[PDB]
Homo-oligomer: A and B are copies of this chain.
């Protein structure tokens, strides 16, 4: 389920990955796991598209990636081809504080679901974790992470 009345142009800017859930532990287990990306910045495009830069631990460095997400019939759902994903769902956001999105493979959504809570500042906002919490309620997550500001300044 996605997000009504979402101007993606208003999410733009630097962001922080506060919480992560995933339907398969193996997706998040170990910092070498896929779908363990760490969002950096949101930069949508005049034509409505959305470009995400983030970090991953691949080799023994914290590599940085850049996914481009083309807009669709649905404002809140985007197409990608990274991390073996092809859907990007924005669940909810007030633009100023937090952003809630998921990633999933349409081929098998259930076993590919990864969801993060994004934050504008690298400080805890429990207000968000709650709305992240209710959002994950119906969602079959078996692994859950969430990071501290000290953690928030660290690379990967």
Residues of B within 8 A of A147 (CB): 25, 142
Contact B142 A145 (CB under 8 A): yes
**Distance to closest chain B CB from A117 (angstroms):** 13
What sequence of 0s and 1s flags, for each residue 123-149 of chain A, a beta carbon within 8 Å of any chain B beta carbon?
000000000000000000111111110
A145-B143 CB under 8 A given contacts A29-B29, A30-B29, A30-B30: yes
Query: Number of A interface residues, CB 8 Å?
Result: 12
* Contact surface of A with B, Cβ cutoff 8 Å: 25, 29-31, 141-148
New A-B pairs, 7, CB < 8 Å, besides A30-B30, A144-B144: A25-B145, A29-B31, A141-B144, A142-B146, A142-B147, A142-B148, A143-B146
Subset of 15 A-B contacts with CB under 8 Å? A25-B145, A25-B147, A29-B29, A29-B30, A29-B31, A30-B30, A30-B31, A141-B144, A142-B146, A142-B147, A142-B148, A143-B145, A143-B146, A144-B144, A144-B145
